[PDB]
A paper describes a structure:
Anti-DNA antibodies (Abs), serological hallmarks of systemic lupus erythematosus (SLE) and markers for diagnosis and disease activity, show a specificity for non-nucleic acid molecules, such as N-pyrrolated proteins (pyrP) containing Nε-pyrrole-L-lysine (pyrK) residues. In the present study, to gain structural insights into the dual-specificity of anti-DNA Abs, we used phage display to obtain DNA-binding, single-chain variable fragments (scFvs) from SLE-prone mice and found that they also cross-reacted with pyrP. It was revealed that a variable heavy chain (VH) domain is sufficient for the recognition of DNA/pyrP. Furthermore, we also observed that the binding of the VH domain Abs to pyrP and DNA was significantly inhibited by NaCl, and that the mutation of arginine residues to alanine or asparagine reduced the binding of the domain Abs to antigens. These findings support the hypothesis that electrostatic interactions driven by the arginine residues in the VH domain Abs may be involved in recognition of DNA/pyrP.
Finally, to investigate the molecular details of the binding of the anti-DNA Abs to pyrP, we performed X-ray crystallography. We first attempted to perform crystallization experiments using the VH domain Abs DO1 and DO2; however, they were not crystallized. An arginine residue (R97) in HCDR3, an important residue for cross-reactivity, was observed on the surface of the protein, giving the Ab a broad positive surface potential. The presence of such arginine residues was also confirmed in the antigen binding site of several anti-DNA Abs. The X-ray crystallographic analysis revealed that the arginine residue in HCDR3 confers a strong positive surface potential on DO1. To investigate the possible antigen-binding modes of the Abs, we performed the docking simulation using Autodock Vina with the DO1-clasp and ligands (pyrrolated peptides and DNA). The results showed that the pyrrolated peptide and DNA mainly interact with the VHs of the DO1-clasp, especially with HCDR2, HCDR3 and FR around HCDR2. In FR, W47 and Y50 interacted with a pyrK residue in the pyrrolated peptide and guanine in DNA. In addition, K58 interacted with an aspartic acid residue in the pyrrolated peptide and a phosphate group in DNA. A docking simulation analysis indicated a similar binding mechanism of DO1-clasp with DNA and pyrP.
Numbering used by the authors:
A (entry chain B): 1 to 116, 120 to 165
B (entry chain A): 4 to 119, 123 to 170
C (entry chain C): 4 to 119, 121 to 170
D (entry chain D): 1 to 113, 120 to 165
The structure:
């Protein structure tokens, strides 16, 4: 039977600078017989592809900020963020490859309770955040474009057949 | 630079099949196993299966035997996935991703939209064409609302930048 | 009081039939034509058709000719809709509504959810594997519902604050 | 070819007290040969049933407050809200019954674009409007898990 991965919480509101902690429980232990624990963490920003953050419980992938740390053992694992920043917002998924089939958690959305201390952001972070909204707008517009594609099809089909 | 370059959006009627492509560049295609993942909009990741291009070996999540078929072509450095007899539960973004210590490199994802006619045969040809044209300003209205929603969200950030 | 009381939500495997009811009370059932309307969320309302209980005559939107059958029963003061051979596209809220100047009176709606295909691979599981998983859905459901509950507690709180120390 | 009903704008931010205007346009004139024009306006709060506001272009339905007014002719109609209240937020749509089949417009969202300037009545109305919104989403979850339960039950019952 596939291994169930439960993430807690499902939605986690914070303010920039806060500590965030995200938990993941597997219905069966992730300790392999060859003694590795194949637990991984991903962050997927809205409208973007997921990116790998941690592999094997606690190893940060080459390039991942120091504020991310992973821990745990067997069935219980935590991801921790020290001082959340705006580019950390998004959907965190846990995954296991100790067992076949490979499985994912349902996801934990990290979002703002009610946001802004905006003038205290650096120029970089401000413009980085604008860039972060652009794929959020592209996904939503793409959705309308493909919706109207479907609305056109039966009408174009009827035209050709008349 | 490693790039997983996936094929464009697909528009399918129920019961059809679609075959999508994942062209890898910037690394030795045959050195790495290619995985595929399904993501319905606003929901979780589902693992579909993998193909090993070095020997064409494949493994499938039971939830996708018969639904998905994985192949590859070494000469083109391209992985393909074919989904058969589509339903509305299959409308989702489909990702390919290269695995070593995990999914380090991801394609941008292929979006599959499964759409729905009879009664339109009662319409005249000019009535069909007028309705087709009335769709265009209706789309623009929806898109313009999305644009303004995002304009509202950007302006305080743009203001903080202007007032530096 | 006029009330149109519709039957509870339905769960249908595709290709089946479903019959819902619209129980009228508080007026002469035969004196007014009963209409039916479809609303998929975030889509506009579509008119399905009507039944005239005074003479059992009907009319159908050509778009739903073949999909819906309207019936009525005087002694029960009840209008019915049967939807045939449901696909996923039939997942929607269905209202009955009484008409005169417009639809002054509306039922509360019947929600029809068309399911999927999973049994295919699930026949290979052990009964314990199955019964263990069937139970694991209840904690998964409660966690999702509690997300909804918290989302709305968030929307209530600024309002509740304004009320407290008003 | 049934009559297409299009509305402008799709979303309208307001604060309680402004004027709201919602436009409704038809692909075909709604003036009937009997010289009546069967255009109606409705309000649907999210998670609730629609309620009739205006019939025949400019007739307020009995019970609808007087700050609501509708006008127009042929293919073009306007609904006006004179000094918006809190109980008016929600979705406005037009409908036509001149031509068979009856068709509806898809709706304009009258939304809220500060709570201390409101009265306790208004805050109470607004608080209560959240209940059918929450139960809508919760019932959606409950039915989703019903569909999820079926395939396992079907396999268990097949032994």
């Amino acid at each position: 039977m596939d291994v169930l991965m439960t993430q807690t919480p499902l939605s986690l509101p914070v303010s920039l600078g806060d500590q965030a902690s995200i938990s993941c429980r597997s219905s069966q232990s992730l300790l392999h017989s060859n003694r590795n624990t194949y637990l991984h963490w991903y962050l997927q920003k809205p409208g973007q592809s997921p990116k790998l953050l941690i592999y094997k419980v606690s190893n940060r992938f080459s390039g991942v900020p120091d504020r991310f740390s992973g821990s745990g053992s067997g069935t219980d694992f935590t991801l921790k963020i020290n001082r959340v920043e705006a580019e950390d917002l998004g959907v965190y998924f846990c995954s296991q490859s100790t067992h076949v089939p490979l499985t994912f958690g349902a996801g934990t959305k990290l979002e703002l309770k009610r946001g802004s201390f905006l003038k205290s952001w650096t120029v970089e972070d401000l413009q980085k955040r604008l860039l972060a909204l652009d794929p959020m707008m592209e996904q939503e517009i793409e959705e309308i474009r493909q919706k109207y594609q479907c609305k056109r099809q039966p009408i174009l089909d009827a035209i050709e057949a008349k | 630079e490693v790039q997983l370059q996936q094929s464009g959006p697909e528009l399918v009627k129920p019961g059809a099949s679609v075959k999508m492509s994942c062209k890898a560049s910037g690394y030795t295609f045959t050195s790495y196993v290619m995985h595929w993942v399904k993501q319905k909009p606003g929901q979780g990741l589902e693992w579909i299966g993998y193909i090993n291009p070095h020997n064409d070996g494949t493994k499938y999540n039971e939830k996708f035997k018969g639904k998905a078929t994985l192949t590859s072509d070494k000469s083109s450095s391209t992985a393909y996935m074919e989904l058969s007899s589509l339903t509305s539960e299959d409308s989702a973004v489909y990702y390919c991703a290269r695995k070593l210590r995990g999914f380090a490199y991801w394609g941008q994802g292929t979006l599959v939209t499964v759409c729905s006619y009879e009664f339109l045969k009662s319409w005249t040809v000019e009535d069909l064409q007028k309705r087709l044209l009335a769709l265009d300003p209706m789309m623009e209205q929806e898109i313009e609302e999305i644009r303004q929603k995002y304009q509202s969200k950007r302006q305080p950030i743009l203001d903080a930048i202007e007032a530096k």
